[PDB]
Design a protein around this nucleic acid. Structure first.
Lengths: 144, 46, 134, 185
RNA sequence: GGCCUACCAUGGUUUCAACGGGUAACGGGGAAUAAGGGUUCGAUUCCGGAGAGGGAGCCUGAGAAACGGCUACCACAUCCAAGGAAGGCAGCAGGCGCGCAAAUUACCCAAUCCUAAUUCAGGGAGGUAGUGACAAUAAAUAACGAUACAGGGCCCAUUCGGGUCUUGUAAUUGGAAUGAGUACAAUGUAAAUACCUUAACGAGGAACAAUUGGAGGGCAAGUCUGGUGCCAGCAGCCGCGGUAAUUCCAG
């Protein structure tokens, strides 16, 4: 019974059958296809630096009705263009075009977060200092 | 519309908050002495 | 500064190095530290070694104070205390003289410069001076 | 290329972070023993969990196993010596019943308090780290010393400390100094 | 020894996966996680292999297909009197570049050992110090006291009172103790720095002042106040915000 072989000389069948059914797993495939290297915008890295191209306003999806104040960024090491959310209020004033921001993942390991559609990234540092410091008036943005 | 978002009013609430300064208070004890304050203040029933 | 007590533990005689070696255990219950020079004075008296056959080098005050422990050597016949002592430990006691030399940078840079010539070097200095003179 | 230094950590954070049972079970272990923080409590349960893993391993093995007999008595006599296992409780079924309470009793930060001379459990902690208590001949300022069974007669004030004689410290010494220059002359 | 050659035979491997392809693959001892079974990692303190910008070829020797040896290239690249010459930091320190991402152009052979004609010389092997919140251990930021209001329940009660039982708010004071630091010394050390000792200074809220995130639920902790009004924003998830926001910005 039970649909799998059980004989003592049948380890090859069980081992090859486990191998074939491992591919249905989401993260086993990405570990063995190298999807992080080839397909992901960051090259399988926690962080990446970029260059700001434009300020964006993205409508929040239902049932929220705000404007999310994100930016469009082009990375240095890849040249790819990603959209990154700019956190709590006034920070879009602290970011401008061509500030060489630093980016991180947005929490959900390659997925969008909250009511923002199609943004997988956030800004951490702008002009090389912080956003927490600039928001809390602990540091000052360099004159550029 | 469905093309742009109005980026004009970023920071419109933090700018207009009627700010008030943190009042100076006596400092609280630190380290093992803070667990004294904590774990008597939660058990004052004599 | 009431008293200090010299207790010599683990005494091993060393005939084939012409010395006696032991653990010095000083108990200074009110002094700050015990200052090896007068240990060398006091260890000389208990071994008849005239303060040049003795050496103390490894002292460590115990935590809380009042006790320090280190190693100690006592030699036969002070002429053999210069034969077998390291040079750095003789110059602490003033028996040997601190030999003067340049740093390792200059001592290596000179060797590389002197590796370029072949011979005495004063055959070439004679023939380059006359070109510099004229 | 020099050989490595072995090291390890001596505590463990609990699995569920926000309880009301475990978080309030620190009434005893932080207010009734006068402790810094939860890491001093997580440290004890780590060693105590280290004890039971060895004891459970031994009980699975056969009785009169030479491995069970050797490491059994060794585990008992180590726990007997520090005074966490009582004088005749010496059985592997009782080291498993051993709990966190009778480890913090053997700490020097409480053994000072129980042997008079401290008048509070965290007046003792201040006195220990201010280099006042010596065990035998040795000043210790570690409040987690975990005294042995042949050591309770040797907790006493240090020969250097002001409360053990030896010319009281810079507060009273200076305080008597200003009355000397005001009343003496 | 098909290692190569001449002659001869037609073999050898494979669905029990040959052959080919990929690997952001040096292999192992080992690391992380810990019911058992497992999953993931291992460039990297030890062992083995390989390489010295790429690929060949060699001299010397016991030992090299050696690169801090030689014979010419290419990502290359230096010097000039323009004729020629010289090079190989995946050694140590440092620079540029690359990036999310990583230290001083410091001191010394005193330890560990190595080499030599050799006790002595030499060793950026190695050690010492600087930078260093990678990780790990221990544990300061206070300890004893004295001093007071305002209630509430009940009891006895004249009604003015106690006489318990508990609720909160501090707020003014005192002598004691100590190291964080500043340092005679000595100790430590190749010489120092630092630790361990230790003379002399070194605590009263103004400091010698602890932060980082949170307070709807998961998940511990406000339906307190001011601002905003589906805006700003928060929110890992469910959700919050459209004029009484326990969720944003503040105290």
């Amino acid at each position: 019974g039970k649909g799998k072989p059980r004989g003592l000389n049948s380890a090859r069948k069980l081992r090859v059958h486990r191998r074939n059914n491992r591919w249905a797993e989401n993260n086993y495939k990405k570990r063995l296809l190298g999807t992080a290297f080839k397909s992901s915008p960051f090259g399988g890295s926690s962080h990446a630096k970029g260059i700001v191209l434009e300020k964006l306003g993205i409508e929040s999806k239902q049932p929220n009705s705000a404007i999310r104040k994100c930016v469009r960024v082009q990375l240095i090491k890849n040249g790819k263009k990603v959209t990154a959310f700019v956190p709590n209020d006034g920070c879009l004033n602290f970011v401008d075009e061509n500030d060489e921001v630093l980016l991180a993942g947005f929490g959900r390991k390659g997925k969008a977060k909250g009511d923002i559609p199609g943004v997988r990234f956030k800004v951490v540092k702008v002009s090389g200092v912080s956003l927490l410091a600039l928001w809390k008036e602990k540091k000052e943005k360099p004159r550029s | 519309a469905k093309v742009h978002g109005s980026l004009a009013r970023a920071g419109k609430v933090k700018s207009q908050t009627p700010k008030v300064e943190k009042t100076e208070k006596p400092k609280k004890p630190k380290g093992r002495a803070y667990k004294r304050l904590l774990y008597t203040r939660r058990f004052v029933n004599v | 500064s009431d008293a200090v007590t010299i207790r010599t533990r683990k005494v091993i005689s060393n005939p084939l190095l012409a010395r006696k070696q032991f653990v010095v255990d000083v108990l200074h219950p009110n002094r700050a530290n015990v200052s090896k020079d007068e240990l060398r004075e006091k260890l000389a008296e208990v071994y008849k070694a005239e303060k040049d056959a003795v050496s103390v080098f490894g002292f460590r005050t115990q935590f809380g104070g009042g006790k320090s422990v280190g190693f100690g050597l006592v030699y036969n016949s002070v002429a053999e205390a210069k034969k077998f002592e390291p040079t750095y430990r003789l110059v602490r006691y003033g028996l040997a003289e601190k030999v003067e030399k340049a740093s390792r940078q200059q001592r290596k840079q000179k060797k590389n410069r002197d590796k370029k010539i072949f011979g005495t070097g004063k055959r070439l200095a004679k023939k380059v001076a006359r070109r510099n003179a004229d | 290329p020099r050989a490595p230094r072995t090291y390890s950590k001596t505590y463990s954070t609990p699995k569920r972070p926000y309880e009301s049972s475990r978080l309030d079970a620190e009434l005893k272990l932080a207010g009734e023993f006068g402790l810094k923080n939860k890491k001093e409590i997580y440290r004890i349960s780590f060693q105590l969990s280290k004890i039971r893993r060895a004891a459970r391993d031994l009980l699975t093995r056969d009785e009169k196993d030479p491995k069970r007999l050797f490491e059994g008595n060794a585990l008992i006599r180590r726990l007997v010596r520090v005074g966490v296992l009582s004088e005749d409780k010496k059985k592997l079924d009782y080291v498993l019943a051993l709990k966190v309470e009778d480890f913090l009793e053997r700490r020097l930060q409480t053994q000072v308090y129980k042997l008079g001379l401290a008048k509070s459990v965290h007046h003792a902690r201040v006195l220990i780290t201010q280099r006042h208590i010596a065990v035998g001949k040795q000043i210790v300022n570690i409040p987690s010393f975990m005294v042995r069974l042949d050591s309770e007669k040797h907790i006493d004030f240090a020969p250097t400390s002001p409360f053990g004689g030896a010319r009281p410290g810079r507060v009273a010494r200076r305080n008597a100094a200003r009355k000397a220059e005001a009343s003496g002359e």
